[PDB]
TrEMBL record:
It comes from the Bacteria. This is Type I-MYXAN CRISPR-associated protein Cas5/Cmx5/DevS.
Amino acid sequence: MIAPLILYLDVPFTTFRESHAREMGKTYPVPPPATVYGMLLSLVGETNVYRHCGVELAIAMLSSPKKSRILRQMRRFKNADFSHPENVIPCYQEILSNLKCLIWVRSDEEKIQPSLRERIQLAFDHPELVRRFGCLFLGESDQLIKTIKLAREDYLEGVRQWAIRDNRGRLTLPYWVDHVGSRNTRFLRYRIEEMDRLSPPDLAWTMVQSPI
RNA sequence: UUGCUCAAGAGAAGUCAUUUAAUAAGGCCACUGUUAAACGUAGGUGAGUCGUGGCUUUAUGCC
């Protein structure tokens, strides 16, 4: 079998807001599989979200990012008038600083060719042939990606904080997100285990599937 | 195309008005640089202005 594609990721600032965190911008410690899947789709310029269902992703944290809060005058659709003062509310948003991680992409379960792994490999091979819009970001549109590159299993050859699918884990990261409400959002429970493995364990792989 | 797409904590504000580190104080009192000698005899030099004036025989020297 083809070795799973490894994508080194370095982001200066990242906000993985929680699904139920609407009054305050609480963030996940680790990028959810849904956010990484959306980032990869943006990287290959794929607008359709159902195109690459079945891809498996594994995330290894190269360091523990620090959590910080920033005030923000975020807008909302509360009043019909755009200039009404009710449309602006001040609330906190939690950000993560200096996020470095390695992403494993495995595309054995995809039924549509070419697979997401092949598309990412081709995009990195010939960047001038990639047809996409906007700037690559992880989280919010203003949180641009500093370094995204093809790496090996030992890019830093140090110690890795894996995200293991544990039913007793603390984090509840979604592998599918319903942006309207929460009906179609699908969750999985993870834990961050400090391990010196250079390849993801079996429980570290998360398959992105439709809620159906 | 990422719980995403959009998103200024923004506009304004003197740390101000007043306050002697001031009043007093000897670095003072004492001290010998005392005592003695043969010059026996042999060591040198760095810097201008230009055509007769008072004496005197031109002379040639004085001021």
